[PDB]
Amino acid sequence: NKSKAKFTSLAVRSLQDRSSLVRRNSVKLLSKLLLKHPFKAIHGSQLRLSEWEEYLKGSESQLNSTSVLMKLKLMIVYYKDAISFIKEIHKSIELISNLLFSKNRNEVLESMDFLVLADAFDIELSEFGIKKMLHLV
DNA sequence: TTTTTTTTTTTTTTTTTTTTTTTTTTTTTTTTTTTT
């Protein structure tokens, strides 16, 4: 699970690569990572930045107010990892939305598939991606 | 249904044809000169 964040960061960085095939494969990797993630034990299949931030704030308040110490520590580090992953996915979504207008059709199709998958899970910036996709006519 | 083969397309890299400017040789007509 730890290497998942590294793979996501490398894929987001490679999204800006000059080669088109590399970009399509990075989009595929991000789609595969978003389709199944370890972040499903609690409130699975729902990636909302506001809700996760509120949950993290609640956990921080609970810790501020024997097993309790490290249990809250693990919960907080898990929530921080979730927030970082959500931010990375949001940045990747923005990059792919900017990347929608490409000469190669396979890249466009994979970008549309990734945006649809990201829209399937409730995402605040998914509507922007759908709006950008609407101009593909 | 699953796997293999074909063929088709997508690049990057190299190769091929086209041609725009860069110089040259020969002839022509006019003007001036010399000679009956």
Curated annotation (Swiss-Prot):
Q: Where is the signal peptide?
A: none
Q: List the disulfide bonds.
A: none
Subcellular location per the Swiss-Prot or TrEMBL entry: Nucleus; Chromosome
Coiled-coil residues: none
Instruction: Spell out the family assignment given in the record's similarity comment.
Output: Belongs to the CND1 (condensin subunit 1) family.
Give the function comment from the record: Regulatory subunit of the condensin complex, a complex required for conversion of interphase chromatin into mitotic-like condense chromosomes. The condensin complex probably introduces positive supercoils into relaxed DNA in the presence of type I topoisomerases and converts nicked DNA into positive knotted forms in the presence of type II topoisomerases. The condensin complex probably also plays a role during interphase.
Assembly and binders: Component of the condensin complex, which contains the SMC2 and SMC4 heterodimer, and three non SMC subunits that probably regulate the complex: BRN1, YCS4 and YCG1/YCS5.
Q: Tell me more from the record.
A: Present with 2540 molecules/cell in log phase SD medium.
State what protein this is by name: Condensin complex subunit 1
Q: Which residues of the full protein are shown?
A: 393 to 588 of 1176
